[PDB]
Curated annotation (Swiss-Prot), chain A:
Oxidoreductase listed as a keyword: yes
Molecular function terms from GO: 3-aminopropanal dehydrogenase (NAD+) activity; 4-trimethylammoniobutyraldehyde dehydrogenase activity; aminobutyraldehyde dehydrogenase (NAD+) activity; betaine-aldehyde dehydrogenase (NAD+) activity; potassium ion binding; protein homodimerization activity
Oligomer and partners: Forms homodimers.
PANTHER family: BETAINE ALDEHYDE DEHYDROGENASE (PTHR43860), BETAINE ALDEHYDE DEHYDROGENASE-RELATED (PTHR43860:SF2)
Protein name per Swiss-Prot or TrEMBL: Aminoaldehyde dehydrogenase BADH
Pfam families listed in its UniProt record: Aldedh (PF00171)
Entry annotation: catalytic residues: E254 (proton acceptor), A288 (nucleophile)
Amino acid sequence: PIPARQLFIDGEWREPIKKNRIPVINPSTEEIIGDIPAATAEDVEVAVVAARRAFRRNNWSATSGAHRATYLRAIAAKITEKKDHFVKLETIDSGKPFDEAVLDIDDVASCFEYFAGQAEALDGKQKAPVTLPMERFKSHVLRQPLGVVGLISPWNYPLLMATWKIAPALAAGCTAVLKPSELASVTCLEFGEVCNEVGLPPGVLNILTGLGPDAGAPLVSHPDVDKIAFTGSSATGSKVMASAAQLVKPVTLELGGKSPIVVFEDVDIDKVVEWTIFGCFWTNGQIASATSRLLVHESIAAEFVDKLVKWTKNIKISDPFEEGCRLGPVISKGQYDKIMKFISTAKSEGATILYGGSRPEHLKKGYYIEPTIVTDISTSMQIWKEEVFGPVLCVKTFSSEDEAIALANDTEYGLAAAVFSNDLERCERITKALEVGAVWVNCSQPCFVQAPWGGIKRSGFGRELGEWGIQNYLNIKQVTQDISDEPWGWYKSP
Amino acid sequence: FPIPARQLFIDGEWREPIKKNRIPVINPSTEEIIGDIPAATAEDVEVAVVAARRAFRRNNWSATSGAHRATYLRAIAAKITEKKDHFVKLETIDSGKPFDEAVLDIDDVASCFEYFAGQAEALDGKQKAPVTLPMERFKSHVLRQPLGVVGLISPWNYPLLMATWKIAPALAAGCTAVLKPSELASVTCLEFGEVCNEVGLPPGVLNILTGLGPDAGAPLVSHPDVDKIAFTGSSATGSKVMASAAQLVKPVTLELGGKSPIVVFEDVDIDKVVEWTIFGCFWTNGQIASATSRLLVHESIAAEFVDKLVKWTKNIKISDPFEEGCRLGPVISKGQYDKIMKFISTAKSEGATILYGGSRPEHLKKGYYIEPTIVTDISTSMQIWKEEVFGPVLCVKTFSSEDEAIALANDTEYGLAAAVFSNDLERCERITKALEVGAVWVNCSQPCFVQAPWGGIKRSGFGRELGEWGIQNYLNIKQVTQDISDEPWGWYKSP
Ligand SMILES: NC(=O)c1ccc[n+]([C@@H]2O[C@H](COP(=O)([O-])OP(=O)(O)OC[C@H]3O[C@@H](n4cnc5c(N)ncnc54)[C@H](O)[C@@H]3O)[C@@H](O)[C@H]2O)c1
Ligand SMILES: NC(=O)c1ccc[n+]([C@@H]2O[C@H](COP(=O)([O-])OP(=O)(O)OC[C@H]3O[C@@H](n4cnc5c(N)ncnc54)[C@H](O)[C@@H]3O)[C@@H](O)[C@H]2O)c1
Ligand SMILES: [K+]
Ligand SMILES: [K+]
């Protein structure tokens, strides 16, 4: 059985005011395994009032970064301590292979530990001097918490994506309301328990589960929420930013993508094929930065794709708890239907389904989709243009570096890309030319909390993580003082 | 001296607007038409953005080094300094600010390009900055690349300086740009085009479209090939701009309005502080975003201070901005003029006291002149206390408690700036931290240095311009992460 919880507001478990709840479904069995609170606008009001109250106390926001760091480290210890509990819940809820979930939960701890360090570095950045040319004045910078922030996250790494926002927010001195995805809210609710166990002050983090328009939208439109951190689809990001615009409320947008993986002839085919499959099929294909468009040099394309299908066919598809699982079911019935629709229109538009594109025969139940390889691609095809968010990879060949770069940048998106070539000068040339927020060289998808992360173009804007993460939650306050004790001397005294 | 007549500045040449419209230039001092400017339309926005995109796709600009771009930025500063007298004169007649104020603006324009030249060179040093990773298998660094084509939209209260705050870092970053300055004061910005050709700025790197906000500004915001908008203007326009940009999930920065508090405690030299409060609210003819327009003064010295405040104010020379000793000129236009007069009138109507001014000066019977206005007996529910007036109009209220002053000062939807006066420096810093604002002046009001970050919170917008923050607004922070192992990943089972 799974946990059963209420909303987490002001250090305590509270029932949604309208008392609606929605199903939790296991994507591996299609069965109802529990349910979660379904917050509405009334719950948002209560949660942000608590967040505002917590922000105004003398125990969090104006405290030192080192002080908040003890909490972040304690959270990291708690998570690591309760590792089995979270991994199992994440696996049951999200359908991702057990081995993937342990890395997620490992990364959650890593991220809180990383931002404890960032909270500490903050102290030394306080009253950072600004050198002015006039001896009459002095200037420095204060870095203060912005205030109450709304954090809205997706389901593909349920607790990790929440953590990418929570850790920086707390590190900065903000208080927060989290609204995780309705497709995978179990571990994020469990996180409320962790907060209470580390004695995180009441109202510092509030957790509201529910649907986007019912719990999320009121969070974005609330007069007393100073900032929104949003991760989701480009279409939703547009709505969120449009709403924020009414109150001129700042947002960050981590949105969708259709990232290319470019592969030249001078590579180790077997090493690149594994990265290619990690690039497009890992996390069951539900990666924002998934390298879902393979561009491979025509001189090695036939051999490459042959070994691609051979590795792909060796991927163990099973219940995510089965020993050796390397591909689980996609997250939901809705997603399953969308992905299957993408596959059919691909076939209808003239694409070749070279492998997969179907349900695994041995698995009667669960939203299981075979890793799918799609060839004979035209660039006008939907499957080439739009984010599928399923284990579906498109293949095109190129003749020259010139054509590789043209094809790689031929997308409205711009989150990431990967480039493979033993000529590292070539790699750098491609790297600079890619219209993208992140470039992997001779790999695809490694994600470190140390490095800034974000897209351009229709993949959104702003950078989370690394030294950039905490500054999304800061008021950069200028303070400049007249130290002369002299009259200004612009006007005439009477 | 003559007022130039100039076409749009596009792709390094002077181009008539496609629909061939022009709009008047009015001298605020005389209410008379002194000239005219191009009135760009959406059609012109399209050709400008195309030119900027083409200029970006070369590697003589976007892909070159910061040091390369810096030679142009310094060339530009030197050219502005060389033509200083010309720009000062045009800025004065066009904007309506005192000549002495315009002199400073143009000094600051040149200083700003110099500062960002330095920031362009520092950018080079920053390229490929190592990022330490825990796994010896992977190495990471950051590339700081120009975002692309940017839309830069600026207000009339410091015409060339406000434009420059955007141009200098955009170009330093390596972006190409379309500037649309205010239709109320476009002369000097258009003139900036001639400077660009004189330093050999590559065609299309900066394009200048003058015209109406809706007609020229909005199509720039909603254009599909503009990657980011840098906006300075009213909170109301800021909302429009961000709502428009949101349709394309287009990043924006917003430098909006304010209703900034000036907090004066009892331990001060009253004549020193009085000059700073008039400077804080009446300088630039009251047309300052960060204007300290809400005077919060200790009840202890309230009486004396307001008395001296009034005396200094009576002594402010109001005149045509070219007149020797001018310390207050006309507000920018008829519409602002009327707006401000209406603010004052409804303030009377709600029972506020017009202690001084509030009226058009006797000896000036044409021009948008308004006496510096001191309004007292305030309630916090009055329009004049809540809303940005943008004229030489100061509200006054007393306080007894420190916690009262803080509460009154933060009792605003805005959050741009603030000023606190106290000989007690421990008290200043305490106040500084508590104010819900992006900038705090201590024992002064309004001095603006390019070296320090600038912007607000709350309804005053978000984002920081200038200082070491200015350049970043125009960058793609690119993570580059590479596998140096040449070993199998070993996640999947090899076939
Ligand atoms: N760029 C990144 O870093 C990143 C990381 C993870 C996932 N993603 C992306 O997320 C998308 C898939 O996840 P999704 O299906 O969860 O996204 P979504 O956009 O459907 O939902 C995301 C979140 O926004 C909420 N939401 C929905 N409508 C809302 C509204 N009107 N107001 C406020 N909130 C609302 C949802 O409830 C959810 O918590 C993909 O497009 C993928 O690329 C991006
Ligand atoms: N925060 C700051 O740093 C700062 C500095 C200077 C001025 N300001 C503010 O600016 C305002 C005064 O200037 P303003 O009157 O020129 O402001 P405004 O917002 O009316 O206009 C500013 C610019 O935007 C344009 N514009 C107008 N409507 C538009 C639309 N729908 N779409 C796109 N563009 C549009 C105008 O043509 C002009 O160039 C005041 O509110 C003041 O506080 C702020
Ligand atoms: K689920
Ligand atoms: K004018």
